């Protein structure tokens, strides 16, 4: 939601690097394969 | 769903699908078309539809974020029809755009 | 309990017994086979039953944590029935499988 801050640490639930978001065959697995704790507000920008 | 069918998705339901369950769905099927409906057609088009569909899917999915994210402004000089009386400036998109 | 019987464990009785108990049961028991009641079976299955039974008891004992863990998925390439239209990818299990 648009009421709080964005997630920071990879052990955070709302973070793309938690255990949850590791959906098989998602482009998130590469960034976690590479062990790059980058957040989603960057991932959002690949669309443009 | 639309896997045993000749190019029948045609960029229609794929965008109606979200950005999580479609990839969570292709990983669910365990077989392809024996009669090859979506395979007898030249696969060249069987590829060029799913991709753009997923593209528009993610696009409309993030279109909601345009409510809590700023209007992306030009980052270069890009001379303006009002570039007289003031010189244009770029903007390096370094800030965190997530408003509060 | 089970020291004096030939192959009667047979990963059936000990199957339901816990994990911390048989480790406790065997340091607990202090009896040698007087009639060789379970010692008539040689080393061939003297320990085989015990090891397979401990495996069954651990599996039944560790099956509980599966209710709050992530699904074990492909660790390697492991081509898919939907190998086309997207490349199958492994997944390093370097994350913590303990869900909130």
UniProtKB/TrEMBL annotation, chain A:
It comes from the Viruses. This is Major capsid protein. It comes from Human herpesvirus 3. The gene is ORF40.
TrEMBL record, chains B, C:
Participates in the assembly of the infectious particles by decorating the outer surface of the capsid shell and thus forming a layer between the capsid and the tegument. Complexes composed of the major capsid protein and small capsomere-interacting protein/SCP assemble together in the host cytoplasm and are translocated to the nucleus, where they accumulate and participate in capsid assembly. Belongs to the herpesviridae small capsomere-interacting protein family. It is found in: Virion; Host nucleus. This is Small capsomere-interacting protein. The chain holds residues 8 to 107 of 235 of the full protein. Interacts with the major capsid protein/MCP. The gene is ORF23.
């Amino acid at each position: 939601p648009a009421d709080e801050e964005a997630p920071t640490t990879p052990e955070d639930p709302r973070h793309p690097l938690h255990a949850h978001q590791l959906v098989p065959n998602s482009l998130n697995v590469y960034f976690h394969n590479a062990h790059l704790t980058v957040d989603g507000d960057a991932l959002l920008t690949l669309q443009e | 769903r639309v896997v045993f069918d000749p190019s029948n998705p045609t960029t229609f339901s794929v965008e109606a699908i979200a950005a999580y369950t479609p990839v969570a769905l292709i990983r669910l099927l365990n077989a392809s078309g024996p009669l090859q409906p979506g395979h007898r057609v030249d696969i060249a088009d069987a590829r060029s539809i799913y991709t753009v569909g997923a593209a528009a899917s993610a696009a409309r999915a993030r279109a909601n974020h345009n409510a809590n994210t700023i209007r992306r402004t030009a980052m270069f000089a890009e001379t303006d029809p009002m570039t007289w009386l003031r010189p244009t400036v770029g903007l390096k998109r370094t800030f965190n755009p997530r408003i509060i």
